[PDB]
Amino acid sequence: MNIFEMLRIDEGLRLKIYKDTEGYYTIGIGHLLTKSPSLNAAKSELDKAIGRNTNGVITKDEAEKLFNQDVDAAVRGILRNAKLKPVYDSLDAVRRAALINMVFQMGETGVAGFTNALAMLQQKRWDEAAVNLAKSRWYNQTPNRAKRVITTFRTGTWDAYK
Template sequence: MDNVKAAAYLRRYEGFSKLPYKCPTGHLTIGYGHNLENGISAAAAEFILQEDLARAERAVKDSFPWWWKLDDARQFVLVDMAFNMGQAGLKGFKKMLAAIESGDFDKAAEEMLDSKYGRQVVHRARLNAEIMKTGEW
């Protein structure tokens, strides 16, 4: 079978939806008619992860002009937090962000842990706080 022609045909008649919807038979569907009840492959999940990670990084870079001054590990903490709770959620950490901008990483870690985030994702928050303090992965 010619996969290029087959894919073009399916794109034409299935149409594209970036958001999940119920198809006429009631199945939750996304993309070009992909039935989400069938799940996704590990390769598709990895692709989505990389796209979501890049989106979170762009959002952090665009929101915090001082981001580029941080080391790689501390940059990652901000990206991870944006990935986990969204850019709006990260922006709510005003005291933590001010501490990071001023270079007070101990205070930033304290603020991170003294939050709903710190209480909800305890292990992840503790690891991120330690990375923020030390600048080491």
């Protein structure tokens, strides 16, 4: 398993503009287009991201291309973040994938906010961090995805995904 595979499982793949769990316009593999309620605004952002008049539909290749960019942006965002970087650097391979998933999902800023869980992860107190991570809006809104990520941090294995 790897990060791409993991995120592909959590986000799925849709080739036509859809609304995410928060009601925002998204396409592909969890690629958020806009938080605006306007579908045209969405279509406009899609066209701009893809580089052609799409009419709200993209191909599989196009989808994977946005995905590759997005995973790369997430990693680079972590590495650039003063709060995240040290955490990421301290972790094993599996658990770094967990941190990336969270950033992919909520953004660097959102994640940098789990101060306490961050300190706990860095200190390798697995069970404590999981308990803290679960007390969050994130967990209450997308409990199954959150539980998968949380288990990965707890265990250091891909079991939640097999």
